[PDB]
Design a protein around this nucleic acid. Structure first.
Lengths: 114, 95, 56, 274
RNA sequence: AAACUUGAGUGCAGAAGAGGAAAGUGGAAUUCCAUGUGUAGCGGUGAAAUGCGCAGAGAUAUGGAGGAACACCAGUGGCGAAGGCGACUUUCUGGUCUGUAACUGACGCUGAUGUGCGAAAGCGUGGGGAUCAAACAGGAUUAGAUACCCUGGUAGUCCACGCCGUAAACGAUGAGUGCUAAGUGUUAGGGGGUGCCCCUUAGUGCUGCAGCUAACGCAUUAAGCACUCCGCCUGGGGAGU
């Protein structure tokens, strides 16, 4: 799955994960908070993701495509520190899906009415 | 032994008839099983230095209430949080 | 569910304190009477890791 | 609650009755009663189709409003009476205009309570409105199946349903038999749960008390003759002696399903019973 | 009986205790699957892993999920009886303490009301059984080990509602003494007045010397000697029968 990189960035206040995968579910690289090593509540801050995905978007040598399709989800102190992380990694940031896990429980049954 | 200075503020829009029944409940939990107070007062039209909940006015009735059973400044604190009757209170433990 | 300060806040522990950082007076604020309880909570909590000088 | 009896007789050794404490009035409306002929397991031909159905105490049907199509007007509860043709209790509701019928009394209902109906109604116990106006995660009862046809689901004492979703052509709702299924959300449904939750803890105790409800004795099919039941003939106490137990009309009655296939509402059922 | 005192009574001014967070919008998971560290990934062995179709089959950065919901403020805390709290978070509930005495004045037995309070299996387990986990499939030796290890795998661990009771409750270690070395910490709060001289000491961690104890060992909180009922060894036994 070369010339493509559908990455999914997770924004939280504890252990922020921002890995870059390929079009198909397959982890091409493994480097983030788990491969970091900071128990001082700094693995989910603005410098966390940037440094966590630094080697992840540098030791790829397979994907690293111009597109990243960053899918940020969930509230976090440095939520805008992961979208720019990929932009400073060497690629760029364009596709952004702003949809966190906060359903409003709103569905509709039969139509054919008002 | 354990004196308490409660300076609770009432709502800016309350009828005197209901105000008398409002202070009666507050005084009932303050003068319960022995009042042992100093002197009661009744402040009226006045302006507060600080603003809280962007109101317009607020009736005053701060009275010293010395206690030994420690049950006069009990419900009062809960009254200015659960229900919407009191806004700014006080919790002084100084003798 | 009430407007409360978190432990992350590091600049919200020395707002109305003296140079040395001792107990603050009751005539130096200007908010509500329920804000004084949070003022004393920022002192005791910041007096364990020596982040707030005891006597500067 | 539940009241026990002192063992003064062998018939009242384990007999347990219900403590009617929720009941307020002991007299029904004279303008809301209809006679009951009591067919007692008999069809139009006169032949017995269903067994175990004898006489019992006389009863009087009480017109119940399962439609609740009186929106705009309010109604205050009058009293909670006892119904013999139902397992739950009924509450006499008084409106304005004229209609004043009975309604299935909810679990948490008291005398002197206002009840509304229609899209523009508050979410309080007793109120009835459309399924689309009910927030997801609410416990409702007396649900309809066809727009303006009357409730047919969750009508038993203690019965209750829970709103889960609205798929895309129906509304998803979990039943009391742990079975999720889609249902049109254009129908109405009462909010809350049915009362009389201690109606399954009652212990008859006497065999003559079952005759009062109208239940005749049930004879076992393993003690009959060969030309009366599959397990008829047999010297002494013998076993089934067949691949699987059969019914009186020679039909498997253990595991074999009977739900007819290719049903109109066979695409509305999401999960099955557990 | 006439009488005043602080050192203790509520604790007189103290600070962390919020005597106590069960928690909806919540977002992070072993399972199905939208669809991924999505197919060797994980539950996974002193040597010894079991688990995931045979007429149609898991791996979790996620996502459409969390629990007995919650990592950090849970501290040699105040501890008032064996008994120190949360995804910040609210309740003052008798109440216990060191330097201090506002108030009357008057000084005992870990105490006859030992409420029979009392980890623990069992008790009012409402609910309970899920990564799982006894047993169980098992895997393993060498001249010797269904053990234990781990594993798909029932129970086994869970909430208000008479109630629930042995302990390493006493580290096999309960009991009113002081005084001939200094302190007296704890969580973090306090003066003489600048924290330099002081701060006796207790709720708690206790620091050895006169004298005892056959010795071991008790001493600014001895078992020397001036203050309570108690009290244990009796045939080793038998006998905890």
């Amino acid at each position: 799955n070369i010339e493509n990189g559908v990455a999914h960035i997770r924004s939280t206040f504890n252990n922020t994960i921002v890995t870059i995968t390929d079009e198909f579910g397959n982890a091409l690289s493994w480097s983030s908070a788990g491969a970091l090593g900071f128990k001082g509540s700094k693995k989910s801050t603005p410098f966390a993701a940037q440094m966590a995905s630094e080697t992840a978007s540098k030791s790829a040598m397979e994907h690293g495509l111009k597109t990243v399709e960053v899918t940020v989800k969930g509230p976090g102190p440095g939520r805008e520190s992961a979208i720019r992380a990929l932009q400073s990694a060497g690629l760029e940031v364009t596709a952004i899906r702003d949809v966190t896990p906060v359903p409003h429980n709103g569905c509709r049954p039969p139509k054919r009415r008002r | 032994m354990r004196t308490y200075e409660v300076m609770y503020i009432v709502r800016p829009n309350i009828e005197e008839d209901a105000k008398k029944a409002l202070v009666e409940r507050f005084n009932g939990i303050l003068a319960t099983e022995g009042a042992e107070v100093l002197e009661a007062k009744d402040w009226g039209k006045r302006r507060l230095a600080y603003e809280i909940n962007d109101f317009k006015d607020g009736f005053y009735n701060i009275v010293r209430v010395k206690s030994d059973n420690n049950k006069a400044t009990d419900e009062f604190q809960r009254l200015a949080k659960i229900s919407d009757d009191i806004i700014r209170y006080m919790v002084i433990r100084e003798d | 569910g009430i407007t409360h300060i978190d432990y992350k806040d590091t600049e919200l522990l020395k707002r109305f304190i003296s140079e040395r950082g001792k107990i603050l007076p009751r005539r130096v604020t200007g908010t509500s009477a329920k804000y004084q309880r949070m003022l004393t909570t920022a002192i005791k909590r910041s007096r364990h890791m020596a982040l707030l000088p005891y006597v500067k | 609650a539940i009241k026990k009896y002192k063992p003064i007789t062998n018939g009242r050794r384990n007999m347990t009755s219900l403590d009617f404490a929720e009941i307020t009035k002991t007299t029904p409306e004279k303008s809301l009663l209809k006679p009951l002929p009591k067919k007692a397991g008999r069809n139009n031909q006169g032949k017995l189709t269903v067994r175990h159905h004898g006489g019992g105490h006389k009863r009087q049907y009480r017109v119940i409003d399962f439609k609740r199509n009186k929106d705009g007007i309010n109604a205050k509860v009058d009293s909670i009476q006892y119904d013999p043709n139902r397992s739950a209790n009924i509450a006499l509701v008084v409106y304005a205009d004229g209609e004043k019928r009975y309604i299935i009394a909810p679990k948490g209902l008291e005398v002197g309570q206002i009840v509304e109906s229609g899209a523009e109604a508050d979410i309080k116990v007793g109120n009835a409105l459309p399924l689309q106006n009910i927030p997801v995660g609410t416990v409702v009862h007396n649900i309809e199946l066809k727009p303006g046809k009357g409730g047919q689901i969750a009508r038993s004492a203690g019965a209750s349903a829970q709103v889960l979703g609205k798929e895309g052509k129906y509304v998803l709702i979990r039943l009391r038999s742990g079975e999720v299924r889609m249902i049109l959300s254009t129908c109405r449904a009462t909010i809350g749960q049915v009362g009389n939750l201690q109606h399954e803890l009652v212990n008859v105790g006497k065999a003559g008390r079952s005759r009062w409800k109208g239940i005749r004795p049930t004879v076992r099919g393993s003690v009959m003759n060969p030309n009366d039941h599959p397990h008829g003939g047999g010297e002494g106490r013998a076993p089934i002696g067949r691949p699987s137990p059969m019914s009186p009309w020679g039909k498997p009655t253990l595991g074999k399903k009977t739900r007819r296939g290719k049903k109109s509402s066979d695409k509305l059922i999401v999960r099955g019973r557990k």
